[PDB]
């Protein structure tokens, strides 16, 4: 019954703009700044592009054409729109290269994302048919639920004392009746197990008496109870009797849609030298030197801890442009908060020399001149 | 030792101008290092959101906690404004009334923080003493 | 303390000690700032004479509007330079 004009808008490109997702979650009790805000952990608005011809006119498929002062001249045309029409009759926009190019930088490292491992390194891919699964069935047993990553219930350890009370009085309290039915289904199957077995050599599931007594038998073994309660509220397992239980489930996909590579078990064949041992190094910056009990380094837009090891010790104003060292990214993963934590590992000497050779800035060429 | 010491002072000087605490995963663009951004133009180190509602505690029922009453009064003994606390008008009125109850009951000073809290803070050995004079 | 009890008086709260990284000259700065954030000078001026409830209430309404207007004006002067930066 939709009108033809209303049927075109449903599939229009503008109507496809995703809603502004909540910002990257941070500690609920901090002193965040209000007037000034730095770049976020992950993007929140959709980045836009246009044709080189339509950009010279300021046409971005928006309400009105954007100004040419800050929208033309750059190589990569990227822009974010906070409001298509604000109270000032202007499209409140801003450059989107902060996050747009950071994705391109990270995708130039050629590194997959793997599930974190407690401290024999085992980098298991995130995109697998055994772990990456959201759909389920009620009949499924508790064990497979650990594999999942998208739980409907909240994380108890993460919730604040106020949020916890609200959850109890608005999600758990008005569920006793339904929970009683859930037990009946379990008790029903229990009666069928003995019958089926003896028959080799289900009931209507309506017994309000066994249920009450069934819960009094589990008061001495709280473990099996929580195991059952976690299935009715879809809570992330917390006790070892494990995966991502230290910081809780990932609010997003374990890869967070930043890289879709499954493994890095490849050897880039170099033209002259041949198949190299490790991956090409990457130059990074130095932020917050040791002399804060750790050093921060900027590896392709992201901030990660320095390798476990001058340069990191003290700051040096004389160095122009700042201290820049080469380094190899070993492992990358997404924490519960959504940040992209990189296991930056010190690079080798030959790798840097080989990689600089193509750039043409290598002081001494390994090819030919090198006698030994 | 003279050059090293001097260099350290100059190094720390710049470290004081980097008004930013880089964390793990925080994305930074070439603009985040500009002076306009490092200046920290924001003049407010304000609270995030209504600490009282998060901890879910009735202030009126915690009038005993002396450290809790000394946190919402200035060193002079004046209740802090909603700007500083960053609370809602209701939670502010509850904490404001919780500071007046304790001071009114006579179990907390009204012009400074509790004495037992002044002993654990800086200047413990310099606190103004009372000579017996007799 | 154990042998001498702390002198608990209004000046005890308005006290600032000298430390290695805070000399006498620096303590005065911290004092003047803390004495100005608590509006000690203003109170002395308002306590010199009596202001009946009506006048006090009406004086607050005038002062409170000039603060909201000023705060609402500073936000407009910075919203202008925000839109100007975008090129509008």
């Amino acid at each position: 019954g939709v009108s033809p004009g209303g049927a075109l808008l449903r599939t229009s490109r503008m109507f496809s703009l995703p809603p502004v997702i909540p910002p990257p979650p941070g500690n609920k009790l901090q002193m965040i700044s209000e007037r000034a805000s730095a770049t976020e952990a992950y993007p929140t608005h959709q980045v836009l592009t246009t044709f080189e011809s339509s950009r010279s006119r300021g046409d971005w498929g928006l309400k009105r054409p954007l100004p040419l002062k800050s929208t033309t001249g750059t190589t990569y045309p990227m822009v974010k729109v906070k409001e298509m029409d604000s109270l000032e009759q202007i499209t409140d926009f801003t450059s989107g290269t902060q996050h747009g190019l950071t994705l391109k930088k990270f995708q130039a490292l050629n590194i997959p994302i793997s599930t974190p491992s407690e401290i024999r390194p085992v980098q298991r891919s995130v995109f697998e048919a055994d772990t990456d699964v959201t759909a389920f069935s009620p009949d499924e047993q508790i064990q497979e639920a650990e594999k999942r990553w998208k739980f409907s219930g909240p994380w108890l350890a993460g919730m604040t004392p106020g949020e916890f009370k609200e959850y109890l009085a608005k999600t758990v309290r008005p569920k006793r009746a339904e929970f009683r039915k859930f037990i009946q289904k379990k008790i029903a199957a229990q009666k069928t197990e003995a019958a089926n077995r003896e028959l080799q050599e289900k009931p209507e599931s309506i017994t309000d008496d066994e249920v009450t007594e069934y819960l009094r038998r589990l008061r001495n073994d709280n473990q099996v109870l929580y195991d059952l309660v976690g299935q009715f509220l879809d809570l992330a397992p917390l006790k070892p009797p494990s995966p991502y239980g230290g910081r809780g489930p990932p609010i997003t996909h374990p890869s967070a849609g930043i890289s879709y590579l499954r493994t890095a078990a490849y050897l880039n064949n170099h033209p002259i030298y041949g198949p190299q041992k490790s991956h090409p190094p990457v130059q990074a910056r130095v932020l917050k030197p040791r002399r804060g009990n750790d050093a921060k380094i900027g590896v392709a837009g992201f901030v990660a801890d320095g390798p476990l090891g001058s340069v990191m010790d003290k700051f040096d104003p004389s160095i122009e442009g700042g201290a820049k060292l080469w380094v190899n990214v070993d492992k990358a993963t997404v924490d519960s908060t959504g940040r992209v934590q990189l296991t930056v590992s010190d690079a080798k000497a030959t790798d840097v020399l080989i990689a600089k050779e193509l750039i043409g800035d290598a002081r001494e060429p390994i090819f030919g001149s090198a006698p030994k | 030792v003279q050059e090293l010491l001097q260099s350290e002072v100059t190094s720390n000087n710049y470290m004081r101008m980097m008004r930013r605490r880089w964390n793990n995963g925080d994305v930074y663009a070439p603009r985040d290092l500009s002076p306009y951004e490092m200046k920290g133009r924001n003049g407010g180190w304000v609270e995030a959101a209504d600490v009282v509602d998060e901890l879910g505690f009735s202030p009126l029922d915690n009038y005993r906690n002396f450290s809790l009453i000394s946190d919402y009064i200035t060193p002079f003994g004046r209740i802090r404004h909603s700007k500083e606390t960053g609370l809602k008008p209701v939670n502010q009125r509850k904490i404001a009334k919780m500071v007046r109850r304790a001071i009114g009951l006579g179990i907390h000073p009204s012009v400074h923080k509790h004495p037992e809290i002044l002993k654990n803070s800086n200047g413990r050995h310099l606190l103004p003493l009372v000579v017996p004079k007799g | 303390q154990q042998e001498l009890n702390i002198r608990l008086r209004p000046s005890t709260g308005r006290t600032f000690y000298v430390s290695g990284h805070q000399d006498f000259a620096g303590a005065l700065k911290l004092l003047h700032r803390t004495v100005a954030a608590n509006k000690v000078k203003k109170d002395v001026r308002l306590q010199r004479f009596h202001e009946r409830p009506a006048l006090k209430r009406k004086r607050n309404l005038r002062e409170r509007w000039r603060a909201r207007f000023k705060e609402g004006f500073k936000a407009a002067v910075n919203r202008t330079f925000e839109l100007k930066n975008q090129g509008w």
């Binding site: 442009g321 700042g322 | 101008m17 070439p30 603009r31 290092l33 500009s34 002076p35 490092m38 | 000259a25």
Partner: peptide, 29 residues
């Protein structure tokens, strides 16, 4: 490369303001 150009600009500003405070500290005494 772009970070270098931006970082160097920050060094200049830092050096100036640092010297400013030093000169501003001579007046306290």
């Amino acid at each position: 490369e772009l970070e270098n150009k931006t970082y160097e600009s920050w060094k200049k500003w830092a050096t100036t303001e640092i010297a400013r405070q030093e000169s501003a500290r001579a007046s306290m005494y």
